[PDB]
Design an enzyme around this catalytic site. Sequence first.
Site, PDB file in Angstrom:
ATOM      1  N   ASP B  25      -7.640   4.397  -1.077  1.00  0.00           N
ATOM      2  CA  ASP B  25      -6.667   3.305  -1.167  1.00  0.00           C
ATOM      3  C   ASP B  25      -6.636   2.405   0.065  1.00  0.00           C
ATOM      4  OD1 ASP B  25      -4.410   1.585  -1.534  1.00  0.00           O
ATOM      5  OD2 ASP B  25      -3.162   3.177  -2.234  1.00  0.00           O
ATOM      6  N   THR B  26      -7.316   1.266  -0.067  1.00  0.00           N
ATOM      7  CA  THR B  26      -7.461   0.379   1.038  1.00  0.00           C
ATOM      8  C   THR B  26      -6.146  -0.307   1.375  1.00  0.00           C
ATOM      9  OG1 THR B  26      -8.234  -1.451  -0.345  1.00  0.00           O
ATOM     10  CG2 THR B  26      -9.943  -0.063   0.726  1.00  0.00           C
ATOM     11  N   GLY B  27      -5.169  -0.309   0.460  1.00  0.00           N
ATOM     12  CA  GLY B  27      -3.872  -0.909   0.796  1.00  0.00           C
ATOM     13  C   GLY B  27      -2.854   0.040   1.455  1.00  0.00           C
TER      14      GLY B  27
END
Lengths: 99, 99
Positions: B25-27
Site C-alpha cells: 500500500d503505497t498510500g
Amino acid sequence: PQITLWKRPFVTVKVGGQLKEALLDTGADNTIFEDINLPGRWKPKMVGGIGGFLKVREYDQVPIEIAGHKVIGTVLVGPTPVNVIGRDTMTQIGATLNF
Amino acid sequence: PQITLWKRPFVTVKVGGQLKEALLDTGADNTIFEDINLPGRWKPKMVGGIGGFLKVREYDQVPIEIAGHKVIGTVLVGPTPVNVIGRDTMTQIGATLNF
C-alpha cells in the site's frame, strides 16, 4: 517515470482542465478528489458512512493526465484528506509496483 | 516480482517469524497487522481517516521478511481491514512505482 517510496508518492495531475497534486495509492480501489471544480456532468453516489451517507459525486468522461499519459476516467468527488489516484486510474496508465 | 494493479497487490510476508498476507500500500506511511502476538513492550499510536480514529499498538525490534529481504523495526498492531505493508517497510525492500 520511476518512483521510490521514501517520500509519499504525490504527483501532479491534470484533471479536467485543472492541475492538482494527488497521491498514487496502490491500496485504494478508486480515484477520489476533494476541493475541486470539474465542469462535467456528475451523478450522485451512495456511500455509507459514520452518521449516514457521505456526500459523494461521480464524474465520468474526465480527462486525466499524469506524467504525459492522457486518459479518460471516472473521478469521485468526496471527503478525502488528500486527492488519491487509485488502481482504476493506475491500471489505465500501466503503473506497476516493482521489487 | 513485477506486480500490476488489476487486482489488489497482496503478497506473502513473514512478520515476527509468522507468515501472513498483506496488501502492498503505497498510500500508507506504516505497516499494520491485525491478529498477531508480538514480544516486548508497545507504545500507543493512532491511525485515522474515517471509520474513525483508531488507537493501535506499536511494537519494536520486529522482524519483517519479504522475499528473503529482512528488516527489524517498528510495526503497528490493531484493527485493520487487511494487513498492510506501508512505505516504511517497502523502502526497505527497494520497492518502486513505475509508470
